[PDB]
């Protein structure tokens, strides 16, 4: 379906982002600043700070390559 996009990131992440976006065409029509927000659950802060929640973080933020970087 998406050879280049499967090359860039994990295949599971690619499948999840296309599924949440609605399709390859649906995802390709979305702005880049919106794709990274795909699958960003509104985790509730349990008294902790918003930074602990790590908000505005999507499936791309949890991908293989992104998780292999220091948090900062």
């Amino acid at each position: 379906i998406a050879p280049n996009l499967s090359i860039i990131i994990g295949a599971s992440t690619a499948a999840k982002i296309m599924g949440v976006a609605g399709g390859l065409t649906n995802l390709s029509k979305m702005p880049a600043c919106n794709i990274m927000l795909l699958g960003a659950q509104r985790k509730t802060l349990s008294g902790f700070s918003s930074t602990s929640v790590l908000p505005h973080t999507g499936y791309i933020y949890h991908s293989d390559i992104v998780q292999s970087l220091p948090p900062d």
Partner: protein, 456 residues
């Protein structure tokens, strides 16, 4: 002759009977003819006219007493013997005599032993009472009590009796008290769910020459090694037997290739000529080991770049990479370095591993927190034997039986112990009076200290 008609069996209350105490009179502090008042549990001088038992009977109106050395019941105010079958449980609590069939059946025993208080427990896995913060000794003894051959050897008194001992020997007191304490541990009819090792601790202090004190929390490894060597030394005749029970249970044969190393700040030609001088050449030395010391690798000392502050984890095989010709170990002795590489020769039927913690650095002593990852189900050790000695051996598969863990800093730590029940296969973790069932999945998720393995 009015026995079998005592109207005072009702006054007996088994709850207040603590036979773990030393059998000495509560007033005269005398060891001769110890008599316990079943009403109160305190020992007295003995059965006789104008004796401490008589005084207690005529004062507190306690009419039933038990002779500690005789295992027979008497009435002091009337002074007559008691012959009943209902009192036999107290006798077994005081003197648990294990028959051969029941000793063998302990491996296949799978019934939940019920105590008098109602706290149903399991044989062998019985809570040990800490006294003065010396849980290391209790953990070591609990680990040792799980060994089947040692249990068979020590459960029956006459098995380790009928041997010649030196006239001035006090080590036999410790070896004969270990049997008593351990047959109290394996007794399935205890009044209380726990066992007090206080007499054993006192005997350990008496025989150890003030080391391994009740007050001090000594190292588990040193205590285990000293206990094994002492048990081997005590048993046998006046001259040591080549194969004592400890020797055939734990001792194995291992080979050291010791090679002298020249000074590293020497010319290359001079180093080569010194090597050719037959002094810095490899020498083979055979030896007998009670246990294998596992040297944990160096800590990372720095945060992991990706997932910061990760506790180090090492596979068991990397530690097991020792004891073979491929891997050396440059011992940095203060005088000169030694190139010593080990090699296993003859594996013992039961294996003891001691993971070296509490290593003294150049200024103090620190505890290495590196965790070892091992398959609890089974391990293979055939690959760590030389080709000459692999023909004799046929069973090199080992399964974990006992695990010791130290929790906390070396200054103040707690010794917890997991033990595998042979009958059910369940792992039970016991810390002082606390006893809990632990899943085998997170056994390796702890700072393993001493491991006891069975070759099956």
């Amino acid at each position: 002759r009015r026995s079998r008609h005592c109207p005072y069996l009702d006054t007996i209350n088994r709850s207040v009977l603590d036979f773990d105490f030393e059998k000495l009179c509560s007033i005269s502090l005398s060891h001769i003819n110890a008599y316990a008042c079943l009403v109160c549990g305190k020992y007295f001088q003995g059965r006789g006219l104008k004796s401490h038992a008589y005084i207690h009977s005529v004062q507190f109106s306690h009419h039933v007493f038990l002779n500690l050395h005789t295992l027979k019941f008497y009435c002091l105010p009337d002074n007559y013997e008691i012959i009943d079958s209902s009192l036999e449980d107290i006798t077994y609590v005081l003197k648990p005599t294990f028959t051969k069939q029941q000793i063998a059946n302990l491996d296949k025993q799978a019934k939940l032993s019920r105590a008098y208080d109602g706290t149903t427990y399991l044989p062998g896995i019985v809570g040990l009472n800490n006294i003065k913060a010396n849980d290391y000794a209790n953990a070591v003894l609990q680990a040792l009590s799980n060994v089947p051959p040692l249990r068979n050897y020590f459960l029956e008194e006459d098995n380790y009796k009928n041997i010649k001992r030196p006239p001035g020997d006090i080590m036999f007191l410790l070896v004969q008290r270990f049997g008593e304490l351990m047959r109290k541990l394996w007794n399935p009819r205890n009044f209380k769910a726990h066992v007090s090792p206080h007499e054993m601790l006192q005997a350990v202090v008496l025989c150890s020459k003030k080391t391994f004190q009740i007050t001090k929390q000594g190292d588990g490894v040193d205590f285990l090694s000293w206990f094994l060597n002492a048990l081997h030394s005590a048993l046998g005749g006046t001259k040591k037997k080549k194969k004592t029970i400890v020797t055939d249970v734990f001792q194995g044969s291992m080979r050291i290739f010791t090679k002298k190393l020249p000074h590293p700040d020497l010319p290359a030609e001079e180093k080569e000529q010194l090597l050719h001088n037959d002094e810095y050449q490899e020498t083979m030395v055979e030896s007998t080991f009670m246990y294998l010391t596992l040297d944990l690798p160096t800590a990372p000392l720095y945060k992991d770049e990706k997932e910061q502050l990760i506790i180090p984890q090492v596979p068991l095989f990397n530690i097991l990479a020792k004891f073979n010709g491929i891997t050396e170990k440059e011992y940095k002795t203060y005088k000169e370095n030694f190139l010593k590489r080990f090699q296993l020769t003859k594996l013992p039927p039961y294996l003891i591993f001691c993971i070296k913690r509490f290593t003294k650095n150049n200024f103090f002593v620190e505890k290495n927190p590196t965790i070892v990852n091992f398959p609890i189900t089974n391990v293979d050790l055939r690959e760590y034997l030389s080709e000459e000695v692999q023909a004799v051996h046929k069973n090199t598969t080992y399964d974990l039986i006992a695990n010791i863990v130290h929790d906390g800093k070396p200054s103040e730590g707690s010794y917890r112990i997991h033990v595998l029940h042979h009958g059910t296969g369940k792992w039970y973790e016991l810390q002082d009076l606390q006893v809990t069932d632990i899943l085998p999945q997170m056994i390796t998720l702890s700072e393993a200290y001493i491991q006891i393995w069975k070759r099956r």
